[model samples]
Target: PSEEEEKRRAKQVAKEKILEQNPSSKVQVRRVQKQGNTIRVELEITENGKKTNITVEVEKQGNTFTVKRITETVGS
Candidate 1:
């Protein structure tokens, strides 16, 4: 079980890195909420002074991670 735990921890760390890269790519983390095994991340993506919100779900399976779902709010 230790190996599995390590893998999960490693993925969590990688998730943090992914979040950090957002701003440079014109995306920003406005909010993040986690419940049980699901994480709902609210992101603001700005382009040409316009902003849009996106909701993404990160699912954890054993020691693996995946982006299970994603929804984007587009506006002008």
Candidate 2:
């Protein structure tokens, strides 16, 4: 019964983190990669007059999701 809630929150947290990191920029959710308790969010964040492509790694521990690792692969 409580399986979906964590996954839902997991996704939200990813977007929230991105916005927090770049409040003056735009966040584009390209796609999401799911693997068991790990949630990988892939998107492109436009900031400082450039498009920053990156991936976020969120791990679901206990009853909450946390933003642990953030990766960036800039491309033109």
Q: Score each candidate by Cα lDDT.
A: 0.62, 0.78
Evaluated at residue 67, the lDDT of candidate 1 is 73
- Misplaced by over 4 Å in model 1 are 1-24
Estimate TM-scores for all models. 0.63, 0.80
Which residue pairs in candidate 1 have backbone atoms (N, alpha carbon, C) closer than 3 angstroms, thus clashing?
Answer: none
Model 2 weakest 10-residue run by lDDT: 1-10
Task: Give the CA lDDT, 0 to 100, for residue 67 in model 2.
Answer: 84
Could you give candidate 2's per-residue lDDT for residues 28-74 as a string of tens digits? 88877768888888879776667788788889877678988899876
lDDT of 2: 0.78
What candidate 2 gets wrong by more than 4 Å, as runs, is 1-7
